[PDB]
Structure 1
């Protein structure tokens, strides 16, 4: 039903889950997301998350994409990322290499706020902070990106477009109602073909609102409101997955 997720709806339904943004940043996003959207040719551009830093200048990350194609048996969304320290000005978040991401994986703890820092790894290697941030963001994006099942559909020229005749996910308190965006609409792969204990779902039937929390990445939240038929996801926290998950379950 909805064409794009609404930022105010996301912030309103994820307020309980602890995913919040400051007042100045909220207003600045409201006034600045369209400007960056139209500066590029992106049909869509929305807030992706807010990573916490050490100095106090949190990294606001937004992602956008133009068209959604299906290629090699999957939905390949060509995305572009931007970051900022304040909601006003948006800078590009450059993609990293492969070995640079492997080295990225070895930095732990929250990255500092200054994007001019350099981390030392081991023959020594210098890792810029923006590379680490992009590595973490792409890791989280690859791991968890939820949309309700069959909320999209193929079409002529084989482009994954929204499904304007979406009836609504039946039985939305179960993981069979939600799926990763990369999964093709026709295929039956959903949020239940991954590990058995890395997703939690809460459901309010009277208000008809479902909240899906990722336990592999404890900062990823998603809402699906059935009465309005509106869904949206957010990330708040540092880009670290809890490897010690089993002892937690």
Structure 2
């Protein structure tokens, strides 16, 4: 999402199925500013929402400097209380390959596995899923992060939107994570749903690798943002459905 003008950045945006509500809207509008006040963040944006089974997660991603570091992730059972999440590594990314169940929505709930009986926390699996999503299907438009000679590439103020000749072009959208950035040369090459909701005023890219991620972008105004209202599953039957 974004940090200012949160009305046009819809939680639904005619996409991703579910979304937020007018019970979680104003609390998030104050909570992103409270996270930006507490933690030293340059920008803060609502990442998305994990479904769960008893409660949601309301994942907000707080961004540090240089726009490329493993930036901070925050979960919240209720939107007034916010906690931290550790930065993900490779071993917690490969430890979740044996579990494929749905999210529970409980921090005390642990997932068991017989390998000697071992247990894993819900929160490390949650931040591993979030890191896999932001390293897999996190997208930005062309020119949104311009190249700097010092090497920071924080915010491009020149970029006001994409012209009408490259909206349907999938290769124009770059990625937020490192491989300037990596364009849409992904492994299925058909894992993106490009739609035009209201004329040529809003383009919606729905992630087919992770069902529930909608990236809205306006071609004339610089308003781009991705929100994941999926359940965090990584369904490996994607070319079976394509």
TM-score by length of 2: 0.89
Q: What do you get for the CA RMSD once the two structures are aligned?
A: 2.3
Structure-2 residue corresponding to 1:59:
57
Structure-1 residue corresponding to 2:13:
14
SS at match of 1:10: coil
Structure-1 residue corresponding to 2:101:
109
Structure-2 residue corresponding to 1:72:
none
SS at match of 1:58: coil
TM-fit CA distance, 1:176:
2.4
Q: Per-residue CA shift, 1:114-144, capped at 9, x if unaligned? A: 2011111122211011111111111111111
Q: Distance in 2 between matches of 1:180 and 1:98?
A: 20
* Count of residue pairs the alignment pairs up: 239
Structure-1 residue corresponding to 2:168:
173
Q: Find out whether 1:84 has 2:76 as its counterpart.
A: yes
TM-fit CA distance, 1:80:
0.6
Structure-1 residue corresponding to 2:134:
141
Q: Structure 1 residues 206, 244: CA separation in 2 closer, same or farther (over 3 Å shift)?
A: closer
TM-score by length of 1: 0.86
Q: Distance in 1 between matches of 2:12 and 2:213?
A: 13
Structure number with higher strand proportion: 1
Equivalent position to 2:177, from 182, 187, 211: 182
TM-fit CA distance, 1:19:
4.1
Equivalent position to 2:92, from 92, 96, 100: 100
Q: Find out whether 1:153 has 2:146 as its counterpart.
A: yes
8 Å CA contact 1:7–1:47 kept in 2: the answer is no
Structure-1 residue corresponding to 2:120:
127
Q: Structure 1 residues 144, 216: CA separation in 2 closer, same or farther (over 3 Å shift)?
A: same
8 Å CA contact 1:42–1:64 kept in 2: the answer is yes
Moved over 4 A (4+): 3-6
8 Å CA contact 2:196–2:202 kept in 1: the answer is yes
TM-fit CA distance, 1:65:
1.7
